[PDB]
Curated annotation (Swiss-Prot):
Interacts with DOCK1, LIMS1 and TGFB1I1. Part of a complex containing PPP1R15B, PP1 and NCK2. Interacts with FASLG. Interacts with AXL. Interacts with PAK1, PKN2 and SOS1. Interacts (via SH2 domain) with EGFR. Interacts (via SH2 domain) with DDR1. Interacts with IRS1. Ubiquitous. It comes from Homo sapiens. The gene is NCK2. The lineage of its organism: Eukaryota, Metazoa, Chordata, Craniata, Vertebrata. This is Cytoplasmic protein NCK2. It is found in: Cytoplasm; Endoplasmic reticulum. Residues 1-57 form the SH3 domain. Phosphorylated. Adapter protein which associates with tyrosine-phosphorylated growth factor receptors or their cellular substrates. Maintains low levels of EIF2S1 phosphorylation by promoting its dephosphorylation by PP1. Plays a role in ELK1-dependent transcriptional activation in response to activated Ras signaling. It comes from the Eukaryota.
Length: 57
């Protein structure tokens, strides 16, 4: 199961991801640092958990 995005943010940079207004993304990574990795149906990069619903299926 993927995640549910709430708020949208426009900004793409190394370590920066843009959030959607109301879509679903795959947010689930396990890093030893504070920054987590995330995947999106159509693109991959940084976890958008900033404002998303994550479900560990």
């Amino acid at each position: 199961i993927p995640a549910f995005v709430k708020f949208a943010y426009v900004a793409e940079r190394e370590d920066e991801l843009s959030l959607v207004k109301g879509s679903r993304v795959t947010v689930m990574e396990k890093c030893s640092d504070g920054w987590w990795r995330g995947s999106y149906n159509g693109q991959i990069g940084w976890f958008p958990s900033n404002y998303v619903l994550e479900e560990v299926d």
